[model samples]
Target: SKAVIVIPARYGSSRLPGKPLLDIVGKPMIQHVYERALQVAGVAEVWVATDDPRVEQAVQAFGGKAIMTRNDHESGTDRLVEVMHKVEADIYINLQGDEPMIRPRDVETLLQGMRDDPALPVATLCHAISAAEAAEPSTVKVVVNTRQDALYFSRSPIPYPRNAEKARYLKHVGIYAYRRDVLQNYSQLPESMPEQAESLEQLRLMNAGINIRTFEVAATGPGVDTPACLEKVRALMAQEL
Candidate 1:
């Protein structure tokens, strides 16, 4: 697959405003993600997708590529779809800008899955979750069938293990690899009830009868949602440095 990592980097957020431009270590947060994408084995290029001039200028300042997109995109999928108009690739990786902890190997793992399975329309990753992470609504949980295809995605604990002594839970990672055509028309699909109920955009894909395959890989550090979470990532990245 001719893969490209399209990182959606909208400037501000309700929780942590100006998230993509937030400083991490010595660089902006989006640069950290762009640098990570550059390390991936199969990827030829990394494109930072943004609607803000600030993000575009920052990316260019770092000598990285940025794709200007519309500011009104409702979800990550919508942003990627917007980028596809100008940037083309066999596989489009919609990576979350907040996941500065993302690893190149995990990216290879996702690309490998798509390369190995030509029929796969969409693919993402997951890591084993602890009881605490599964209990948090901020951490998305995914339940997969025997084939390892995602059965459902939610902000709540799935499989609601009742009468079961033990259970294994997987936390959904924030990157998605989509075949070009799937994303070209995905924005046209109507958002579903479950998607609205849970506030999970992946559900919108499932509602449109799309089967998302998930690969389990080595865990990266936590994502940044709030200031405290950013500090946690700072501590984790400090160890790496």
Candidate 2:
């Protein structure tokens, strides 16, 4: 299946403004994310969708493609839809611009999952959560059925695991792959109860009776959000460089 990856790069993050243009090592953070997305074998193109002119300039400076989007997009997926109108592909991957260390293998894994089941509207990656991360609301948890379809996603620990052996809790990775038409439909769907309550857009799909196939990843990289996170990423990049 043909796939195009879109990295949503918002400049006005409440937590870290102008985040996409921030330097990591020597290159801008969004560049790192775009390069990583390009590393996926099946992805035909990678584009940065941003609302800021500076972000578009930075991406072009690095010989990367970017599209200017409306500043009022409610979510990254919505921004992706705006970009999709300019690019054509059968599958669309929502690559968060803040995740500079996203593994190429993880991207391939998600694409493969979606390819395996054409019926699935969307696919995503997850991993077995460490016990320490289980209680962290920031580390969203996912519960899956035996068939590997997501049962629920929550900031809270799932299943309660009351009487049975403690089940493995899967930590939701931020990467997602969607069928083109499904993504367009997803953008049109109204906000659902669970989505509103948890502020997780994935819940809206669940409420609409859409099945999201999830594949397991070996591990995930840190996603930059705050000054502390930026500092940590800088240190990690320094080590790599």
Candidate 3:
């Protein structure tokens, strides 16, 4: 089965405008994410799905593939669906441009899980998080069933700590892998109440009774959500070099 990776890199971010082009160390942030996607073993192609000509231009400058998408996509998956119409692949990996720290192996894990379960419509990654981080509304948490499929994803602490010590938290990494058919028909699915309540689009799939299989990976670093987050990535990358 063929898999393609698409990074939805919008030029406009409410926190940090034009962040995809923002310099992290020496290269653009989107470029860093593109390079990471290229390293995954089973991916057939990697493309930056962006709404801006400038982002498209930058991807081209770095010898990466990019496609121009409409600027008004409500979500990155919407951007991915647009690419799905143009790119032919059995599976589509939605690698958010903000997650430059995403490990290639984690992506590989997500793909392999989907490949293993032909019935699964969607798959995503999660990793262990401390209680403090889990409590933070900014960090999305996921609860999983024994089958390793997500039961719920929320901005609030999930499996709420009625028994504090028994609570375990898994942070939902924003990366996703979707079967071509699932993505093509995605936008047509009506907005779901839980999805609207949590402000998480993935809930739309869950509300429709689609199983989102979850793959666990060791801790990965933060996405570039703010100027402070960009600094953290810079410092982390610099330490590695």
List the candidates ranked by TM-score, beginning with the highest. Answer: 3, 2, 1
Model 1: per-residue Cα lDDT over 33-130, one tens digit each: 99988999888778988889988999999999988888888777788888888887999988889999887888888999999999999999999987
State which candidate has the highest lDDT: 3
- Provide the lowest-lDDT 10-residue window in model 2: 159-168
Q: After superposition, how far is residue 145 of candidate 3 from its true place, in Å?
A: 1.1
Question: Per-residue alpha-carbon lDDT of model 2 for 1-241, expressed as tens digits?
Answer: 7898999998988888899888899888998898888889987888889999999998999899989999999899889888777898999999899999888988888888888888888898898876667878777899988888999999887857674366667899988898888876866688988888888988988988888888897877688999899999899878877
TM-score, every prediction: 0.95, 0.95, 0.97
Give one digit per residue, the lDDT tens place, for model 3 in 149-180. Answer: 89989999998899999999999988889999
RMSD of 1: 1.4
C-alpha local distance difference test of each model: 0.88, 0.86, 0.91
TM-score of 2: 0.95
| Residue 5 accuracy (lDDT) in model 3 | 95
Query: What's the lDDT for residue 28 in model 1?
Result: 90
> Which structure is stronger by lDDT: 1 or 3?
3
What's the lDDT for candidate 2?
0.86
